[PDB]
Scaffold this active site. Structure first.
Site, PDB file in Angstrom:
ATOM      1  N   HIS A   1       0.816  -1.219   0.000  1.00 28.34           N
ATOM      2  CA  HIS A   1       0.000   0.000   0.000  1.00 28.34           C
ATOM      3  C   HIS A   1       0.853   1.274   0.000  1.00 28.34           C
ATOM      4  O   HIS A   1       0.652   2.160  -0.829  1.00 28.34           O
ATOM      5  CB  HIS A   1      -0.824  -0.051   1.254  1.00 28.34           C
ATOM      6  CG  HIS A   1      -1.901   0.937   1.354  1.00 28.34           C
ATOM      7  ND1 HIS A   1      -2.188   1.594   2.538  1.00 28.34           N
ATOM      8  CD2 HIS A   1      -2.814   1.368   0.439  1.00 28.34           C
ATOM      9  CE1 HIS A   1      -3.235   2.396   2.339  1.00 28.34           C
ATOM     10  NE2 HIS A   1      -3.651   2.249   1.090  1.00 28.34           N
TER      11      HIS A   1
ATOM     12  N   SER B   1      -7.674   6.466   0.232  1.00 26.65           N
ATOM     13  CA  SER B   1      -6.240   6.335   0.487  1.00 26.65           C
ATOM     14  C   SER B   1      -5.472   6.591  -0.769  1.00 26.65           C
ATOM     15  O   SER B   1      -4.338   7.068  -0.718  1.00 26.65           O
ATOM     16  CB  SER B   1      -5.633   5.074   1.019  1.00 26.65           C
ATOM     17  OG  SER B   1      -5.975   4.792   2.355  1.00 26.65           O
TER      18      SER B   1
ATOM     19  N   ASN C   1     -12.714   5.224   3.987  1.00 25.31           N
ATOM     20  CA  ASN C   1     -13.711   4.456   3.236  1.00 25.31           C
ATOM     21  C   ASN C   1     -14.961   3.871   3.843  1.00 25.31           C
ATOM     22  O   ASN C   1     -15.202   2.723   3.562  1.00 25.31           O
ATOM     23  CB  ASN C   1     -13.075   3.199   2.718  1.00 25.31           C
ATOM     24  CG  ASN C   1     -12.563   3.290   1.376  1.00 25.31           C
ATOM     25  OD1 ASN C   1     -12.821   4.255   0.668  1.00 25.31           O
ATOM     26  ND2 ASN C   1     -11.847   2.253   0.958  1.00 25.31           N
TER      27      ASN C   1
HETATM   28 HG   LIG Z   1      -1.953   3.996  -3.144  1.00 27.72          HG
HETATM   29 HG   LIG Z   2      -1.233   3.620   0.821  1.00 30.09          HG
END
Ligand SMILES: [Hg+2]
Ligand SMILES: [Hg+2]
Lengths: 279, 6
Positions: free
Chosen positions: A69, A224, A161
């Protein structure tokens, strides 16, 4: 400069209308600015970073991004192919573990760390911090974000989210920072995006192509994902001399595309991050 | 936040 067949989010951000595929930006591309990516870490050796990225602090056993991520978000901020600010310097702060979780006290510590660490970095154009994370309301987390912002760093944080009002989420509910909602490629609010009066701006967040661990790429969705777009845009505009860390959020909102998004509930701003580039 | 989909 223009980047042809760019990821849609990059094109969206230098266009006044949806559906284009070229990303037009100024060649300065954020050089001289620095962006701290406070997340799962960054795979610094990924070629798309061209050596402009490095790990600066971990709160775990390793400084490595075993999640992806963080590498994903750093990439949208400043990888060569997938980034907004293609020449910016990236500093990774691993406050999240390889499963993507972390405690509030270590995420607070990572923010305090950046406030201090920035003082020994050479970032002539300014410093940005990008926080693609959040959780339930915490006045202490909100508070660490406000301190970082006041220390002179442009703080960009995810709305979160839950398709809910961002007021019950932290750092998202800290008014002094820049809370970013997500949109999709049709100019609709992302279905998962939080909303509310606390949001400052929207950026592309649905199916965003960017870097991934293992020297690869992947498209994921999430507010994000929107956050780094605005963090990168901020870094870009600061190196251009348009704004400062302290006023960058308000400046992005002032120059945003207005009224273009659909599915925005009454009370939420209808503003989409826009670089205003003119050749 | 938002995530780390399609
Ligand atoms: Hg990302
Ligand atoms: Hg991220």
């Amino acid at each position: 400069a223009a980047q042809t067949n760019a990821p849609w989010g990059l094109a969206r951000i230098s266009s006044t209308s949806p559906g284009t595929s070229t990303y037009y930006y100024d060649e300065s591309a954020g050089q001289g600015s620095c962006v701290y990516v406070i997340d799962t870490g960054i795979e610094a050796s990924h070629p798309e970073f061209e050596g402009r990225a490095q790990m600066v602090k971990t709160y775990y056993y390793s400084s490595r991004d075993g999640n992806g991520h963080g590498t994903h978000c750093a990439g949208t901020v400043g990888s060569r192919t997938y980034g907004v600010a293609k020449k910016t310097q990236l500093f990774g702060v691993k406050v999240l573990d390889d499963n993507g979780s972390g405690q509030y006290s270590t995420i607070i510590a990572g923010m305090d760390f950046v406030a201090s660490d920035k003082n020994n970095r050479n970032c002539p154009k300014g410093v940005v911090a990008s926080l693609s994370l959040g959780g339930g309301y915490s006045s202490s987390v909100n508070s660490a974000a406000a301190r970082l912002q006041s220390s002179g760093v442009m703080v960009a944080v995810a709305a979160g989210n839950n398709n809910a009002d961002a007021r019950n989420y932290s750092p998202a509910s800290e008014p002094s920072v820049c809370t970013v909602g997500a949109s999709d490629r049709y100019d609709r609010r992302s279905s998962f995006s939080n909303y509310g009066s606390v949001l400052d701006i929207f950026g592309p967040g649905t199916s965003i192509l960017s870097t991934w661990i293992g020297g690869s790429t992947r498209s994921i969705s999430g507010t994000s994902m929107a956050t780094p777009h605005v963090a990168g845009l901020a870094a870009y505009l600061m190196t251009l001399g348009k704004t400062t860390a302290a006023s960058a959020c308000r400046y992005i909102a002032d120059t945003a595309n207005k009224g273009d998004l659909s599915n925005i509930p009454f009370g939420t701003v209808n503003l989409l991050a826009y670089n205003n580039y003119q050749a | 936040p938002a995530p780390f989909p399609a």
